Amino acid sequence: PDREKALELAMAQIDKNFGKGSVMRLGEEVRQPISVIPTGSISLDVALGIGGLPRGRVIEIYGPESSGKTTVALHAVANAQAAGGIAAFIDAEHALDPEYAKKLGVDTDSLLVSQPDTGEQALEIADMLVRSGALDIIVIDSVAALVPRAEIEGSHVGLQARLMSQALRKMTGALNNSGTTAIFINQLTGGKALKFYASVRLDVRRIETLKDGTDAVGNRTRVKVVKNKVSPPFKQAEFDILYGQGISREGSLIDMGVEHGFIRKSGSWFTYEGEQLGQGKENARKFLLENTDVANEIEKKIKEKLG
């Protein structure tokens, strides 16, 4: 009754009893199924293990303020759209900036935006939009702003705690067979259900501040995927987010380039196979920003060393 043999027999029994990966081995490099929306952060991408947010799954991106939570969820919309996808933004904060969005790849013009008046309306015009099976990805800004009918009029009665549960229980099954990934957005309540409904929960907190004797811009953001049901949990990644420009595609190619030995840092002087790119990082990102082919091979080389 060989252990490793006994273990696998009883382990596979759960997957068929409770789900795909109700039981993962933190080491497993399991990769199948896909149909993922790249988040635009090669780093965070692999971090997820499937290289992107699993579609048709409910996702949560929590963090404090000015963390870049929205930035990521937006990059997600750009991509989903850029591949013939219909996006729906259920605004309840009214902070969204089109100018920052369009400059990331979003087709604002063809972007469904809705500004509910109550928590219930927000999670209705959203669950309804999910069932039309027309959307690919739909993000709801601020789980917090989703305040109940009352509390808006005159706590005591049904609070968000259930407001969120009800809608989740009814909307989880829906996108499940709709192929429409659902991004929630939190902000260190009803998140006591979302924490149990999400198949992927991301923890976005700002770490440092890229800068150059200048007045700063973006900020090295770190992301810890604390709950993942598609690939193994607890992985993390970091990526630059330039002020008013988004996540640095090129800048991510370096951090990942030298991390997987495709680039070298002799005297803080980067170089991709013989041909050096420049000194410092911001100068190397400026280089890759020009000639895309070179950056293209690199991206093409890391996409192989891993899926």
Curated annotation (Swiss-Prot):
Binding-site residues, ATP: S66, S67, G68, K69, T70, T71, D97, P98, E99, Y100
InterPro entries: AAA+_ATPase, DNA_recomb/repair_RecA, DNA_recomb/repair_RecA_CS, P-loop_NTPase, RecA-like_C, RecA-like_N, RecA_ATP-bd, RecA_C_sf
Family matches, as Pfam families: RecA, RecA_C
Disulfide bonds: none
Chief place of localization: cytoplasm
Gene3D superfamilies: P-loop containing nucleotide triphosphate hydrolases
Keyword Nucleotide-binding: yes
Coiled-coil segments on the chain, per record: none
Protein name: Protein RecA
High-level lineage: Bacteria, Bacillati, Actinomycetota, Actinomycetes, Mycobacteriales
